[PDB]
Design a protein around this ligand. Sequence first.
Ligand SMILES: Nc1nc2c(c(=O)[nH]1)N[C@@H]1C(S)=C(S)[C@@H](COP(=O)(O)O)O[C@H]1N2
Ligand SMILES: [W+6]
Length: 263
Amino acid sequence: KALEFSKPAAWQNNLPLTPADKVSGYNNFYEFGLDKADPAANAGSLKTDPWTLKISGEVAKPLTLDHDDLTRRFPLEERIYRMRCVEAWSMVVPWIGFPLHKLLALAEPTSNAKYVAFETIYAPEQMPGQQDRFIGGGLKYPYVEGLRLDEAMHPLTLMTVGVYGKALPPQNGAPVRLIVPWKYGFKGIKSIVSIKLTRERPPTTWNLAAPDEYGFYANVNPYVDHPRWSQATERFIGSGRQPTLLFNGYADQVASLYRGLDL
Ligand SMILES: Nc1nc2c(c(=O)[nH]1)N[C@@H]1C(S)=C(S)[C@@H](COP(=O)(O)O)O[C@H]1N2
Ligand SMILES: [W+6]
């Protein structure tokens, strides 16, 4: 479904784009199966409209948004970001959405709020992966993720509601999905149902599944490898190899957040 959005020059560029059919044909969405083609083939069984997105926790004005809100409450913008999955493949995608800080501003987070916890919809009857230990990759469902508050407020982190000029296909995490371009793809949680501001660091699906391989921060870094493969290089998914950049190329926009700190 086509939709209206602006094209801020800050997020417009000359990066060669990943074809739309690959953006929505090569996916990781375990709730619909482990294979890259499983989501495009099975995600159609998920009902994305009506939708309820609930903002709560250490917030002063907890609110809830319906499906129409996702595309009208805030002005939409197209941003051409690179998307680097931890498995060493990457894409350049023209997402569409609104910065997460505009949403958090409405809820007005309290002085105790330190982290943001996200949760994906739970519908075992529409999601085959939520029923088979191997089909769903053995992940503890529903999928959960979190960000430190300053990360969630960064102007780069996007609440994504569409791609390539149109609403998001279900395989891409329709109707609302998270995108943090400087981190590995698993941080970009799909089909969000809940956003909670918390005082402590929330749990993370992949870090719970393998604490030794997937960290909480997961910043794209070519110098720190994955226990089972190097992160120095990556397969660009174009039509039909390149070195991985620090923070996936947004180092000068995000380095500030991590200077002088550990992990
Ligand atoms: N709910 C949910 N969100 C998710 C996943 C998932 O399996 N379930 N996998 C992802 C991982 S590991 C990647 S690399 C990206 C992929 O987004 P895309 O399919 O739209 O490219 O989504 C992340 N978000
Ligand atoms: W990934």
